[PDB]
């Protein structure tokens, strides 16, 4: 039983992601102030588990064992902001190497990318971190992210 925290600028898809993950549903635009927390049972490689995800609105962060930091490939400011999210996990859980998974959401808005995939991969080498592009819109790559976060909780 593992508690994970989604971190990210407003509007990048933390919510659409968490909900595509937990119940295979996209919310087109969801009350943005609602920081939800969603307990679910899943099965990871199988060795199967329970995760309590805090979906943040961009202090249950003392107790958080894992972070998904999220940006939108369409929004460089969101991406630069992953670096403030970074030094928050550190001021808080307190080292240089918490379990962390870096994600660029909205990969489906490819005509509108302001952020390259090698940029994301290079921020991920900073954290030493797995890195993913997802589209929550189309549930693309969404399981992989949460399952990799789980494998860094347990590899640490
Ligand atoms: N095209 C597209 N839109 C998305 C995706 N994920 C989220 N959105 C849209 O982006 C907005 C914010 O989603 P949301 O999950 O609520 O962002 P949050 O503020 O991080 O929690 C809404 O207008 C969503 O429909 C995506 O993968 N693709
Ligand atoms: Mg939200």
From Swiss-Prot:
Major subcellular location class: membrane
Effect of residue 15 to N: Dominant negative. Loss of interaction with AFDN, RLF and RALGDS
Consequence of substituting residue 33 to S: Loss of interaction with AFDN, RLF and RALGDS
The reaction(s) this protein catalyses: GTP + H2O = GDP + phosphate + H(+)
Entry GO CC: plasma membrane
Subcellular location: Cell membrane
Tissue specificity comment: Expressed in many tissues.
First-level EC class: hydrolase
Enzyme Commission number, as recorded: 3.6.5.2
Disease per UniProt entry: Noonan syndrome 8: A form of Noonan syndrome, a disease characterized by short stature, facial dysmorphic features such as hypertelorism, a downward eyeslant and low-set posteriorly rotated ears, and a high incidence of congenital heart defects and hypertrophic cardiomyopathy. Other features can include a short neck with webbing or redundancy of skin, deafness, motor delay, variable intellectual deficits, multiple skeletal defects, cryptorchidism, and bleeding diathesis.
Function: Plays a crucial role in coupling NGF stimulation to the activation of both EPHB2 and MAPK14 signaling pathways and in NGF-dependent neuronal differentiation. Involved in ELK1 transactivation through the Ras-MAPK signaling cascade that mediates a wide variety of cellular functions, including cell proliferation, survival, and differentiation.
Similarity comment: family membership: Belongs to the small GTPase superfamily. Ras family.
Oligomer and partners: Interacts with AFDN, the C-terminal domain of RALGDS and RLF, but not with RIN1 and PIK3CA. RLF binds exclusively to the active GTP-bound form. Strongly interacts with BRAF, but only weakly with RAF1. BARF and RAF1 association is dependent upon the GTP-bound state. Interacts with RGL3.
Name of this protein: GTP-binding protein Rit1
């Amino acid at each position: 039983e593992y508690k994970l925290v989604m971190l990210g600028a407003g509007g990048v898809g933390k919510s659409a992601m968490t909900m595509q993950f937990i119940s295979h549903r996209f919310p087109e635009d969801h009350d943005p102030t609602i920081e939800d927390a969603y307990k679910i049972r899943i099965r990871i490689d199988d060795e199967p588990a329970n995760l309590d995800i805090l979906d943040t609105a961009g202090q249950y962060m003392r107790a958080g064992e894992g972070f998904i930091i999220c940006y939108s490939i369409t929004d460089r400011r969101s991406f630069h902001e992953v670096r403030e999210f970074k030094q928050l996990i550190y001021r808080v859980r307190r080292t240089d190497d918490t379990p962390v998974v870096l994600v660029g959401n909205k990969s489906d808005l490819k005509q509108l990318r302001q952020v390259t995939k090698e940029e994301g991969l290079a921020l991920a080498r900073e954290f030493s971190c797995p890195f993913f592009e997802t589209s929550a819109a189309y549930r693309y790559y969404i399981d992989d992210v949460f399952h990799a976060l789980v494998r860094e909780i347990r590899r640490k």
